[PDB]
C-alpha cells in the first residue's frame with residue numbers, strides 16, 4: 001500500500017540558497033550547491049514507523065536509518081554531526097528536531113510530508129529560514 005516508500009525525484013526547490021547562507025556557506029559554494037540540488041533524488045523504504053532513506057545527487061549519496069520516536073545521529077544540511085529525533089505530526093507528516101553534537105550554531109529542523117495528490121514535500125529550517133523541496137515519484 002502507498003506510503004513514503006518509493007523513488008522520488010525533485011521538481012522544485014525554494015529558498016535553498018538562503019538556508020545555506022544562514023549556515024555560513026560562501027557565495028560560490030552556495031551557487032554550486034543550488035546547481036547540484038536540481039539532481040536531488042530520494043529513495044525511501046518505510047515499514048511501520050521504521051525508515052530507510054537514501055538522498056543522493058550526481059556525486060554524493062547518504063543513507064539514514066531511523067525509527068520515529070528514537071534518537072539517532074545524522075548531520076545537518078551543512079554536514080555538522082547532530083542528534084536527531086523524529087515525531088509524527090499527522091498520518092503522513094513527520095518532523096525532526098536536531099541538536100549539534102559539538103559546538104554552537106543555528107537551530108535546525110526538517111519535515112517530510114506525503115500530500116493527498118502524491119507529492120513528497122521536504123522542508124528544512126535554519127533559524128528564521130525555510131527551504132521547501134517538492135518531489136514526485138520517478
Ligand SMILES: *C/C(=C/c1ccc(C#C)cc1)C(=O)OC
Pocket residue numbers: 040053055076077110112122124
Ligand atoms: C530527509 C532529508 C533530505 C535531504 C535533501 C537535501 C539535503 C541537502 C543538502 C539533505 C537532506 C533531510 O533530512 O535533509 C535535511
